[PDB]
Design a protein around this ligand. Sequence first.
Ligand code: MN
Ligand code: MN
Lengths: 343, 343
Amino acid sequence: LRIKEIKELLPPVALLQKFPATENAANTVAHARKAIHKILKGNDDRLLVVIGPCSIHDPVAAKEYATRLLALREELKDELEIVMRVYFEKPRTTVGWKGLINDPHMDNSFQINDGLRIARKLLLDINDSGLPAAGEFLDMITPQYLADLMSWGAIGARTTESQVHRELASGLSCPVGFKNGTDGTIKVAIDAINAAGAPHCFLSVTKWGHSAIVNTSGNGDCHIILRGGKEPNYSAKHVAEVKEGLNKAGLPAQVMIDFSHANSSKQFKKQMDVCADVCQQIAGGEKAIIGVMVESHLVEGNQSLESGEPLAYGKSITDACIGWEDTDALLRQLANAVKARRG
Amino acid sequence: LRIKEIKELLPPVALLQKFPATENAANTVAHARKAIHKILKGNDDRLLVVIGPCSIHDPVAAKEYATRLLALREELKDELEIVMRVYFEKPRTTVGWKGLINDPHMDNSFQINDGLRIARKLLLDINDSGLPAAGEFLDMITPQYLADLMSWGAIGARTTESQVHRELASGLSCPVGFKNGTDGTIKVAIDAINAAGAPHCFLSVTKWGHSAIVNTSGNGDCHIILRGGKEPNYSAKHVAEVKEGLNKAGLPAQVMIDFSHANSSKQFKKQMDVCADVCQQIAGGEKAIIGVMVESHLVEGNQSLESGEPLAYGKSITDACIGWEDTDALLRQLANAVKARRG
Ligand SMILES: [Mn+2]
Ligand SMILES: [Mn+2]
């Protein structure tokens, strides 16, 4: 057998009971989801902005970032719907740290029970403060522990074509963005949107920690996310092709543009260049761009865990992010671009 | 919420108790896994042949097919290690029938409990007759109900890059083949092989139907499956590039070639053309080709569930397959090629 050991896992209900949603938290989620729904439906000209760390590895830095971002969210609420990237799960090209939930202590001790408690506690605090959260839905079992506190979700480039993730999206209570393939393929995301919009029947683990048969209604609040491929795909030229592709597929011609990952060629400072281009498109009247994604942290760059020496505070241990000063500038640029488009 | 209904699911132990593996079925699995391991280690010059229906939709036709295939398995055993495709799970491009387990009655009744009982009983019958089984591991929960009766597994083109599928493979007791991406991307499969070979810690459902924390050892019996992209990738030029790519990644230059799907341009009869070329490669001395995959049924072609017309017996309701006559001829061609390669 290739199973070394099997260990006890607290059921979702244990986490929901220990960390119940507060009225403020529930309101934050309900309002954010509705706001995003209105944008996708075309009943609001504001831009959805999913911004924050590539991954959460420290609740302290996470809450500090959340407090700073909440101020920006309030300041620019007329042009932007700001949602924090609160990513607890990370897909790896091969192997590596999978996130706070899988290995919170970042030492391969895999204390997942601790990870889930730490994650829900933080997610609860952030929502309670009035700031919506976004994250990648990678795992099929973790959703039950945190989905009630998520206002928007993403299906990664490496899983957009996966039927199991499309099934999951079809039953999520929040809007969902599907990233194009790592090679830049757009079709897998368009297909994912259509698939997730239909009802599905599949096996899933309930809040009681038991497997069961579930039937979903389908999720109409799904959209594509352009995150680049071999080459970036954020330009007006690419946006134009994607819009036609969506229409041809019978879908609304709308897109979210990720400024990071392949669109910045893995160079964090380049997110500022992507921003400039996207702002020009938006300011120029491009109504298709309904959202953007940015990897930002308190301090720019990133650091390695394999290094050894203590970790620098508020610095990413996964993908490099832009610092807070550039983050303030970028959010401002976007807000102004939205105003320009609005006229 | 987008969750319409939640229904009770029999736990794996219920199916294991109702349908225990017989001594002969257990032997079939044990011997097949060992034989494939020997081929993957370069200690056997025979060819692994995973052949059978695109999908199983009728136990009666499946068993008739199994008897016919078993006869050839015994007759050609000195050259081929024949394993029947007994696929109960199907990944769709968008939406569609997902296979016998998900909807055994093929009418959207999704009687999965019936599906699991029918599936395991069929696997038990086929294995007890001495014929090993192959299947795609798409779902994260169904493995516990059938894995003990699987001699080889596949991770589909649409899920090879998925971390959750790589995790699953890392803990499977049988050899696993990773298909290249739908766009022909080879790198995702090479990365998958390395990822699956390492130990993983993740959440999964136990045989008791409860979620838990699992630790895997890693699966060293993984290989790539060439199934085409925008263009077929079965020719010597492509095999050469893949052998080089595997070696560059520190892996043995071995490949399984799927004659169907993108390699036949989804035209079932071209599987015979792919066979002719692959046989020439094998007979010519290509040792890297350790296996092939072929979509075959009692009757050639396919049919749709959409018309409402009664289904023809022994004919695929998913991808088109070659019929029995062509199957017998193809298997003999492969056996002759392996004999020639040996000289
Ligand atoms: Mn990232
Ligand atoms: Mn097929």
